[PDB]
Structures are given as C-alpha cells and as structure tokens.
Design a protein around this ligand. Structure first.
Ligand SMILES: C=CC1=C(C)/C(=C/c2[nH]c(/C=C3N=C(/C=C4\NC(=O)C(C)=C4C=C)C(C)=C\3CCC(=O)O)c(CCC(=O)O)c2C)NC1=O
Ligand SMILES: [Fe+3]
Length: 207
C-alpha cells in the first residue's frame, strides 16, 4: 500500500536528513535555544508556503480528508516565535536561507499547479514526521535547553486527542487515495525531494 511504499522509498532520504549535523547537535544538547529559534524561523517560512499549497489542494477536492486543517502549524509557530524572540521583531528580521528559497519555491509551484499528488508527498514528510518524532524534539528542547512548553506549540497538535490512532487513520487515508501509476510515481519522487529539501535546510542552518 502507499503508506508502506512511502516509508520504504524514502527511508534512505529520512536517514540523511535525520542524522544531519545541525539536527544531531541540536538534539544532543550541543547547541542552544537561539539555534532552535533559528530553525523555527526557517520552518515558519516553509510551513507558511506548505499551508498555502495544502489550502489550494484541499479546495480542489483532492485528498480532502487527509488535509485536516487541524494540522496547520504556521499560526502556532508565529506564536512560539513571539515567545522565543520576546516580540514580533522577528517578522522583519528573518530571511529565507538558500535551502528555504528552493523549498518554498517548489511549494509555491505545487500550490499554483494545484498538484495534488506532489502536495500529499510534502504533507506526509512534514506532518507525519511532526506527529511521529515531534514529541522527542519538544522533549529535548525542554530537557536540554529549558525551553518553556508554551513556546513549543508547534509540537502539541492542539485539537488532536489520541495521537497513535490519528497516525493510523492518516496512513489508512494514504492507502485509500485514488492514484494513477503516473500519479503514484510522481508522489513518491516528490517525497524523496521533500526529504532532500529538509536536509539542505539543516545543512544551511549548520552553516
Ligand atoms: C527533516 C528531518 C526529518 C523529517 C521531515 C522526518 C519525517 C518523518 N519521520 C517519521 C518517523 C520517525 N522519525 C523518527 C525520528 C526523528 N524524526 C525526526 O524528525 C528527528 C529529528 C528524529 C530523531 C530521533 C522515528 C524513530 C520514526 C518512526 C516513527 C514512525 O514511523 O511513525 C515519518 C513517518 C514515517 C512513516 O511512518 O512512514 C516522517 C514523514 N524525520 C526527520 O528526521
Ligand atoms: Fe522522522
């Protein structure tokens, strides 16, 4: 089924991204809230784009049930960024790193083409990862750096009760999407690209 094909097809790419030096250093406690704050700022930029593409694709009637508005992160992230930075100065200060320009560009292309299969791929890579590994990242931020849980809204998924059931239903929804061979292939290739973008985001943060 598609959920299994996605996981396996992308496993290599998930591994490259997951074990990048910046994320590895961040999670081990080698870095700081400032570095975590920089990541969330870059994530705000790309979640903002992702969610415009989700909106376009949901509106077209494609994969509707999967593209649960409860997953939207951009607004909670801004709120986390207001707390982390102590004001909204960040909105005028932040600039997309080169990795984020490419990532955001691809998201805007998908938005504008209203490319359902491609958007699903990006949705899987960001949201199922947030739901899967996000409590680990949040827990490390509180543990290593004393980050206040109120500045970790991005990881809380307010509005979802049983998380493992949610993930299971999300995978069933993936397995239920109607897709041509052409569309399945395009989705799978796009999932690898999504991991490729995210790894470069961390590389650029590492620099
Ligand atoms: C850009 C980096 C990055 C992305 C986009 C990412 C996404 C991601 N991680 C996942 C699972 C997972 N992710 C992790 C671990 C991590 N996940 C993390 O993001 C980090 C920092 C860790 C480090 C511990 C583990 C253990 C699983 C298995 C859980 C599952 O399959 O639901 C899944 C679901 C796999 C599936 O069920 O098909 C996705 C889409 N993981 C990443 O690392
Ligand atoms: Fe992960």
């Amino acid at each position: 089924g598609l959920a299994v094909e996605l996981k396996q097809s992308t496993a290599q790419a998930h591994e490259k991204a997951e074990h990048s030096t910046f994320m590895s250093d961040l999670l081990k406690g080698r870095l700081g809230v400032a570095e975590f704050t920089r990541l969330q700022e870059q994530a705000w930029l790309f979640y903002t784009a992702l969610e415009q593409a989700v909106d376009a694709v949901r509106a077209s009637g494609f994969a509707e049930s999967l593209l649960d508005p409860a997953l939207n992160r951009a607004e909670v992230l801004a709120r986390d960024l207001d707390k982390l930075n102590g004001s909204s100065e960040w909105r005028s200060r932040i600039t997309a790193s080169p990795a984020v320009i490419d990532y955001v560009n691809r998201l805007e292309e998908i938005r504008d083409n209203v490319d359902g299969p491609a958007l699903v791929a990006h949705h899987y890579v960001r949201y199922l990862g947030d739901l899967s590994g996000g409590q680990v990242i949040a827990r490390m931020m509180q543990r290593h750096y004393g980050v206040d849980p109120e500045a970790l809204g991005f990881y809380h998924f307010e509005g979802i009760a049983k998380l493992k059931v949610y993930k299971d239903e999300y995978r069933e929804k993936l397995n239920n999407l109607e897709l041509s061979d052409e569309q399945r292939e395009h989705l799978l290739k796009e999932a690898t690209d999504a991991f490729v973008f995210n790894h470069q985001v961390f590389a650029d943060l590492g620099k």
